[PDB]
Design a protein around this nucleic acid. Structure first.
Ligand code: MG
Ligand code: MG
Ligand code: MG
Ligand code: MG
Length: 122
RNA sequence: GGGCACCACCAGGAGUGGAGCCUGCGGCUUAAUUUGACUCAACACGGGGAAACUCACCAGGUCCAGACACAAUAAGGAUUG
């Protein structure tokens, strides 16, 4: 299986982390959405009380929609790298990443862009 | 017994010790009147003539500048403002 299984969002996130352009957490994400900063939106599916998700949706709506599904949040966090050192390989203490919004991007083109386009044009 | 030296004395000078005042050091005083050093070899010495700084003392307040290791919160905020 050569085709990516929604692995042109995770990569983007990683890139952002590397270059320091991630609005992780909710307030930060909201802020990003509000001004010329928040370009891609990343909201958790499994949200208790549905409230955070709703908020995120609202934010997305407000001017320009940059949203996507997200696979449980924890996975995303893991991919990003939430934990120092963590032995030789893997073995990171699990953390729920919560709401994330992308600033900067950094890396250009590749499959992420395509995915974004697909999400957009309907 | 024999040497040597105006930090010994002679022969002399200038003196200090008195006077007032500076400044050191005691003693007392004081929250605290920071401390070191008392024969020459402590006492205008600490290059020490302190207005704060210096600064060590006292009365009061501020600050972490608690490197690093390992867990409790680990974003429904750690703590920073
Ligand atoms: Mg002598
Ligand atoms: Mg004096
Ligand atoms: Mg003298
Ligand atoms: Mg003076």
């Amino acid at each position: 299986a050569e085709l990516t299984i929604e692995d042109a969002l995770k990569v983007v996130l990683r890139t952002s982390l590397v270059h320091d352009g991630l609005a992780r957490g909710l307030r930060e994400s909201a802020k990003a959405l509000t001004r010329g900063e928040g370009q891609l939106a990343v909201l958790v599916e499994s949200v208790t009380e549905e409230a955070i998700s709703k908020l995120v949706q609202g934010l997305a709506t407000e001017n320009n929609v940059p949203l996507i599904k997200v696979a449980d949040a924890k996975q995303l966090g893991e991919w990003a790298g939430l934990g120092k050192i963590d032995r030789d390989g893997n073995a990171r203490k699990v953390v729920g990443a919560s709401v994330v919004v992308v600033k900067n991007w950094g890396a250009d083109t590749q499959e992420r862009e395509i995915l974004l386009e697909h999400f957009s044009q309907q």
